[PDB]
Amino acid sequence: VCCSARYNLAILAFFGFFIVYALRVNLAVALVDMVDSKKYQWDAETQGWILGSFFYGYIITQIPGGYVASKIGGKMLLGFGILGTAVLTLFTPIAADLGVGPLIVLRALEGLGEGVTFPAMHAMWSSWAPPLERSKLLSISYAGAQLGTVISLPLSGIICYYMNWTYVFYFFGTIGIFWFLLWIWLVSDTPQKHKRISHYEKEYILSSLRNQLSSQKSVPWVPILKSLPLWAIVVAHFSYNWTFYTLLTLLPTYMKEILRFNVQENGFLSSLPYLGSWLCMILSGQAADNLRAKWNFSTLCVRRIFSLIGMIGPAVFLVAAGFIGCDYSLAVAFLTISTTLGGFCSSGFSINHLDIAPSYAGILLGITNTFATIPGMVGPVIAKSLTPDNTVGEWQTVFYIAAAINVFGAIFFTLFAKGEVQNWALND
């Protein structure tokens, strides 16, 4: 039944991430319409910092967000993070008028508010998803970001065409509040707290989670930081984020500067890879859960297979993108194929935090994001320093580096990953 309580939560989280990512993306396309050459005379560096200061706040509140979510539950953290994002987005037109400093402060506040949503959602699923249904539920929850980017890219441009650029922020921000009103009303942080959950569904979920939750009184920080299986996930996530920062920022820039294709202006062709990623995310979660449920594959084997696919497969196409030459059509094809194969990581390492320690998945995902958000802020300078002459060979070297990092991460995860609850997560 589609209207079951846990899938209702999954759909609501899907739309929450859709809204948050649409809010995040629409700035990148409203900016080009408001900058000069009233219009604001911000150069390339000022625009880059306006865009990138979000992550300097996004990084900070990952581990604290996970810890607080494990202590009190994720409902309020997620709801208020997304509400803060929306409300602060509503003020972007004013902050732009005060000046660069106020706007960078606003973006940093958005990042701080938004840092807790992912660890909070993991800590929320640690109480809602039965072990043999995590792949479906988490995939449905996190495909919202992909669909949000897909819908935000063209619709914001349409709004700017028919309305002033401020209405983009107004529209998405008010939709954020209208979603928060549903989140406050329809969702609870645990099945025992749910107001409408049927008796047998609660019994089913609690019975499924009965022997995986922890009896411990306090977080095992030392075991968490000492466990090799966690560092396997960290190494996988860092490599994945580096590879996809490359794929979705540098490769479009490669097409812009070397091939002169200007994909950023086309719009729809830019959203195509995200649509493919959304569809593959959902279907690879479905297939990954079926493999564990019906065919009786070991969880670790499924994680290994899907991580190897979703990491190594994109590497080959990313490397090929440097050899395609003047044909930008096949460059777009490789971008789309790589971003589509990227969906398997939604059932690969991206879920393994719950697998190795469900009771502390919030903290584990907080640590993993704290490590994996670094590439999104170190890549700009690396690319700037690796392509001084801006020729095909330098971009080929950049793609070689990205593919090498991706393959090393995939191999490390394959070697050192685990798919069963660690003993340090069960009892003192």
From Swiss-Prot:
Species: Homo sapiens (Human)
PANTHER family reported for this sequence: SIALIN (PTHR11662:SF432), SOLUTE CARRIER FAMILY 17 (PTHR11662)
Compartments, record wording: Basolateral cell membrane; Cytoplasmic vesicle, Secretory vesicle, Synaptic vesicle membrane; Lysosome membrane
Catalytic activity: N-acetylneuraminate(in) + H(+)(in) = N-acetylneuraminate(out) + H(+)(out); D-glucuronate(out) + H(+)(out) = D-glucuronate(in) + H(+)(in); 2 nitrate(out) + H(+)(out) = 2 nitrate(in) + H(+)(in); L-aspartate(out) = L-aspartate(in)
GO process annotations (BP): amino acid transport; monoatomic anion transport; monoatomic ion transport; neurotransmitter loading into synaptic vesicle; response to bacterium; sialic acid transport
PROSITE patterns per record: MFS
InterPro entries tied to this protein: MFS (IPR011701), MFS_dom (IPR020846), MFS_Na/Anion_cotransporter (IPR050382), MFS_trans_sf (IPR036259)
Tissues expressing the protein: In the adult, detected in placenta, kidney and pancreas. Abundant in the endothelial cells of tumors from ovary, colon, breast and lung, but is not detected in endothelial cells from the corresponding normal tissues. Highly expressed in salivary glands and liver, with lower levels of expression in brain, spleen kidney, muscle and pancreas. Expressed in acinar cells of salivary glands (at protein level).
Cytoplasmic side: 70-75, 119-139, 188-218, 289-304, 352-362, 418-428
Sorted UniProt keywords: Amino-acid transport, Cell membrane, Cytoplasmic vesicle, Disease variant, Glycoprotein, Lysosome, Membrane, Phosphoprotein, Symport, Synapse, Transmembrane, Transmembrane helix, Transport
Principal location class: membrane
Presence of keyword Membrane: yes
Gene Ontology MF term list: carbohydrate:proton symporter activity; D-glucuronate transmembrane transporter activity; sialic acid transmembrane transporter activity; sialic acid:proton symporter activity
Chain ranges passing through the membrane: 9-29, 49-69, 76-96, 98-118, 140-160, 167-187, 219-239, 268-288, 305-325, 331-351, 363-383, 397-417
Family per record: Belongs to the major facilitator superfamily. Sodium/anion cotransporter family.
Membrane topology classification: Multi-pass membrane protein
Keyword Transport set for record: yes
Effect of R6C: In SD; frequent variant in Finland; alters intracellular localization, only partially targeted to lysosomes and mainly detected in LAMP1-negative vesicles and in the Golgi apparatus; completely devoid of L-aspartate and L-glutamate transport activity, but retains appreciable H(+)-coupled sialic acid and nitrate transporter activity
Coiled-coil region(s): none
GO cellular component, one term: apical plasma membrane
Protein name: Sialin
Parts of the chain on the Lumenal side: 97, 161-166, 240-267, 326-330, 384-396
SUPFAM superfamilies: MFS general substrate transporter
